Amino acid sequence: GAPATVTEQGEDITSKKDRGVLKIVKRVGNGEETPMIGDKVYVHYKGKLSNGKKFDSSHDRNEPFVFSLGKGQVIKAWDIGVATMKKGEICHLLCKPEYAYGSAGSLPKIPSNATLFFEIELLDFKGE
Numbered sequence: 474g475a476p477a478t479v480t481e482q483g484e485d486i487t488s489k490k491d492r493g494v495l496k497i498v499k500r501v502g503n504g505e506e507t508p509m510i511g512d513k514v515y516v517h518y519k520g521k522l523s524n525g526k527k528f529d530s531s532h533d534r535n536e537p538f539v540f541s542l543g544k545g546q547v548i549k550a551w552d553i554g555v556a557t558m559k560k561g562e563i564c565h566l567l568c569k570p571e572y573a574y575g576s577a578g579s580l581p582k583i584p585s586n587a588t589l590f591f592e593i594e595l596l597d598f599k600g601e
């Protein structure tokens with residue numbers, strides 16, 4: 474399925490090249506610009522534990538998910554991965570625990586050492 478495809482074909486967008494954040498573009502966006510640290514980003518997404526459990530549809534097409542990029546308002550994998558997106562782009566993002574909740578997890582929802590998968594659509598972004 475989609476997580477396996479990102480394992481096999483995904484691009485490693487980590488600084489360390491440790492495969493901790495793997496990406497596939499599923500729909501190409503518009504233009505060339507991608508958001509800078511401090512930009513406000515507006516997203517629709519859905520995600521899960523990579524093994525299918527704990528599905529999150531809270532922002533799948535209803536109210537946008539909003540945060541300021543590169544400020545640690547989200548897990549590291551998102552500050553890294555949403556930064557690479559164009560407006561209108563949809564990507565698949567596979568996130569190892571060191572870029573997500575680590576060995577701590579976020580119990581009971583996220584277990585210790587969990588890999589996460591997201592389908593993310595960047596709707597817009599704007600300067601601070």
Ligand SMILES: C=CC[C@H](C(=O)N1CCCC[C@H]1C(=O)O[C@H](CCc1ccc(OC)c(OC)c1)c1cccc(OCC(=O)O)c1)c1cc(OC)c(OC)c(OC)c1
Binds near residue numbers: 527538540547574
């Ligand atoms: C299948 C994945 C679960 C998903 C998740 O991991 N997400 C949500 C979508 C963005 C990526 C990731 C996330 O970053 O979630 C945070 C959790 C809180 C948080 C933020 C920063 C952290 O480190 C810098 C961190 O370490 C523990 C914990 C999140 C959830 C909801 C919103 C949010 O930001 C936008 C906002 O506050 O509106 C951010 C999620 C979704 C949640 O609510 C929809 C969560 O709150 C109950 C949640 O808590 C752990 C986790």
Ligand code: NA
Binds near residue numbers: 539
């Ligand atoms: Na806002």
